[PDB]
Amino acid sequence: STGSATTTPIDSLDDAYITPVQIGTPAQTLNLDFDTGSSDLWVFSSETTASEVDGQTIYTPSKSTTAKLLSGATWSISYGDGSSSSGDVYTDTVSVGGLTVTGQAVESAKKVSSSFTEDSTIDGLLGLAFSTLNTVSPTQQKTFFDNAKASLDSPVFTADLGYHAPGTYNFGFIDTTAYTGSITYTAVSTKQGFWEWTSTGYAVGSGTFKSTSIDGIADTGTTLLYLPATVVSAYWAQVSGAKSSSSVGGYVFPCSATLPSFTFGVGSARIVIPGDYIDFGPISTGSSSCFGGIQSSAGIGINIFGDVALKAAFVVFNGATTPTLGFASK
Ligand SMILES: N[C@H]1[C@H](O)[C@@H](Sc2ccccc2)[C@@H]2OC[C@H]1O2
DSSP states (O other): OOOEEEEESTTTTTTOOOEEEEEETTTTEEEEEEETTTEEEEEEEESOOOOOOOSOOOOOOGGGGTTTEEEEEEEEEEESSOEEEEEEEEEEEEEEEEEEEEEEEEEEEEOOOHHHOTTTOEEEEEEEEEEOOOOOBBOOOOHHHHHHHHGSSEEEEEEOOOSOOEEEEEOHHHHHHSSSOOOEEEEEEEEEOEEEEEEEEETTSSOOEEEEEEEEOOOOTTTEEOOOOOHHHHHTTSSOEEETTTTTTEEEEETTOOOOOOEEEEEEEEEEGGGGGEEEEESTTTTTEESEEEETTTTTTTTOOHHHHHHSEEEEHHHHHHHHEEEEEO
């Protein structure tokens, strides 16, 4: 089997991407944030505290003839940005772009943090990291991909995120028309439960390539590119007037600037992030200070190849017995 679904930026900055997902019988369609950096499928629901729902579409398990309460199961997750949610668990039928999983754990939120409440466009998350990170207790549950894998034509999914435009998540096949040149595959460590890999280096604009190992995770649920402070300083040094602002929370730059590209290495291959992918616009409405899309990972504890990086590539998440990651230009 295969599945194919369009993923769409939630706003003009590509702050996140949402993908329609069918849950239950009859189908209830929710727009979920596909997150290769976590492993819970959770949704706003009829059980979510009323004051914490503001415009989201909710899952109502009582209206689904295939929903079953997973007795005694609860979940609670806290994300790297400080966001959180928690609740109980149903199993139900879940379909993505024509690919159907029966008995998928659908984690129903009773509580969500303010950041989720304030995001009216995101109805929940669909985790695509390794199932070892799933937070359901006392019986850990599998991700949608984990459940689908054996049925897929090939045990893979691909992320093709657009810049200020829609893109595609495919399951079970590699669309050879969706990228240019070849896909370069690179080793993955699953030891921390992430799609963790090691970039071979970087370049800033037309500068020389610096060969250096950068361990990080491929994370579709993180907006920006978080890299070591040395690398990030080298990038913003090429932007006149750019500086790190403790009050704003990272590097900012004059909105009148032209940003240089940023290249990262995948083995001997190179992925080029165009400069305008690194512009996240005024720090507040009407400001001439703009927020940068490349930020320091100091304090996070891990480097993160988020959407700023991934949207410059066609990315293969290869879930074979020894997982790997593939990157192609597009
Ligand atoms: N793996 C990522 C996860 O999806 C988000 S949770 C989130 C919060 C608000 C809006 C959308 C998503 C959090 O920030 C980056 C990292 O942890």
